């Protein structure tokens, strides 16, 4: 439903037996605070492309493909494993702070086109979209989703929408204010951007539920029974047809492999993951104190066991985007 | 050099034996201080859309296409000609002064798509262009062009790029100094922008020389002979294997209709022309002070009298299109 010729070759190039277990690394702003947590001077940029082409050796080979940015990762995209494709994200770094609208914007000097001749084989863009926001600002929203989506049907190439929701009125994701309309913003905005005008072919998207407020995983004010969750997890599941895959969110990974056991016995039917920090958030620190070859080691010891004990829970936990389309 | 049976058809629908002559009347800001002159009151919505509703209404029987924007001419569009194609307007009026990168932006909540689904045959975008400006800047431009031609390869709709040459450096571009340099900046750019990446099916361009400078045509100072001025014209034509369409630029009925019978004998193949405000700009003056029932009756004379030449005289020298396609 309904890939052409080229687009399911790129699907299949960046995941195994129908299920896409994907390293992500496009983090620019996210990525630069986490290093200025650790030293004096700011990142510089043979730091940044330095951090990335080390996870990318180091991890692809054992992930089905992985995301990196056109700013800082096409070195690390030249030395990533064979057997792993690659994604590039399209969409600029961040939001306008001063404003609540946090409206999509593309790097200036790339498109569709260029990213596919850059090597990737798949465009993804993160949209920030808050359900009930503005419907003048979401009009604009899904205007530029339609564009994106025909950009890439002309390019025949795969397009990965990524949606991270929050609240014009609610200044903090992880309160549990925001937590009691999550489930709301996350499925109604996926119910959104799987009709067919928008050109989506996976839609990567958070988990409806913060876990940390629910029953047995919470430590500390609980929000939901154990049922209550599972039935977040249904719901995102009757939300829409397309493949969609789960972003780490920056949780420990073990919290995050505990998530997909549990998103998996609820009966939701995702279809792999795009993990980043929760794989690889402890390189960084090791990389700016200890340098380069440090960080190395930290990947083939601590990244490899993250990411590993991941794949090990996808293979029980995930379902085959082969059943969708 | 190749057309979808669907962009074929929609050419088709926009010209007349393979010629294009079509109406302009997508100004926005331009029309709106052309109404400011006459009235003390500040021009309403309902003022702009009613006059493109009688310009569209009265002169689309006499045209192949025409011309509107989606802010102000849906209504226009719904009363044109049975027999007359659709083209909307696809970018933001105007430009930034306080600086000279011009660059382009696309109207907010539009995309090719809603412009097809608003019932146009093709999309129209307008690009301001310095071949010699800052590479940079150009790169940027070069970058959404790109994703515009494959929004429309996706959505099967004829892409017309609309190319304004400019200097970063001249203020003015009707000065003489401007002039010395016009061909170049016209022709190079038909050269950008003719390459394949780019999926423009037709360019609308200005003529490659201020023929106010020119032997015979200028009234006052001459900087170019009939000879240089034809190889203008010939040099233009081997800039593109692309059909183009000439552009009035505000310049008189009279000089713009003489610029064709001169361009089809120095040798350019232009293939039809868009045509404004030396059509219809009389309506203004009539509309705003006789009223809307007296701009009607200047349409039906005045109007009709003004694109019955410009008929008379693209018979006799435009080229059909399908000889390059
Ligand atoms: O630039 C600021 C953003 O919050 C950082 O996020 P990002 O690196 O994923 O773009
Ligand atoms: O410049 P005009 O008025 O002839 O119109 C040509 C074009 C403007 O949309
Ligand atoms: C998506 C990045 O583009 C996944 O990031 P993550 O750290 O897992 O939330
Ligand atoms: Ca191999
Ligand atoms: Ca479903
Ligand atoms: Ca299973
Ligand atoms: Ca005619």
Not at 29 to 40: D, P, Y
Not at 43 to 53: A, D, G, H
Not at 79 to 86: K, M, N, P, T
Not at 249 to 268: C, I, M, N, P, R
Request: aromatic share 10%.
């Amino acid at each position: 439903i309904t890939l052409t010729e080229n687009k399911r070759k790129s699907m299949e190039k960046l995941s195994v037996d129908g299920v896409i277990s994907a390293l992500a690394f496009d983090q620019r702003g996210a990525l630069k605070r986490m290093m200025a947590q650790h030293q004096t001077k700011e990142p510089t940029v043979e730091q940044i492309e330095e951090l990335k082409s080390l996870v990318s050796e180091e991890l692809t080979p054992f992930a089905s493909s992985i995301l990196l940015d056109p700013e800082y990762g096409l070195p690390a995209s030249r030395v990533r494993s064979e057997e792993a494709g690659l994604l590039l994200a399209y969409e600029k770094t961040g939001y306008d702070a001063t404003t609540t609208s946090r409206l999509p914007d593309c790097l200036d000097v790339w498109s569709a086109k260029r990213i596919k001749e850059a090597g990737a084989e798949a465009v993804k863009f993160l949209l920030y979209y808050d359900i009930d926001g503005d419907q003048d600002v979401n009009e604009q929203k899904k205007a530029y989703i339609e564009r994106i989506g025909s950009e890439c049907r002309a390019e025949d190439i795969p397009f990965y929408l990524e949606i991270l929701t929050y609240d014009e009125k609610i200044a903090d994701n992880a309160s549990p204010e925001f937590a009691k309309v999550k489930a709301h913003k996350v499925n109604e905005a996926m119910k959104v951007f799987s009709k067919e005008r928008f050109g989506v072919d996976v839609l990567k998207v958070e988990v409806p539920v913060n876990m940390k407020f629910v029953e047995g995983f919470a430590d500390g004010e609980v929000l939901f029974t154990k049922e209550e969750a599972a039935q977040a997890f249904r719901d995102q599941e009757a939300s829409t047809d397309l493949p969609y895959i789960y972003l780490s969110a920056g949780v420990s990974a073990k919290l995050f492999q505990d998530t997909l056991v549990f998103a998996a016995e609820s009966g939701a039917k995702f279809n792999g993951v795009l993990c980043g920090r929760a794989t690889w958030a402890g390189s960084v620190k090791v990389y700016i104190e200890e340098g380069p070859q440090a960080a190395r080691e930290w990947l083939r010891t601590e990244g490899f066991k993250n990411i590993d004990e991941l794949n090990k829970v996808l293979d029980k936990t995930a379902s085959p985007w082969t059943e969708k389309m």
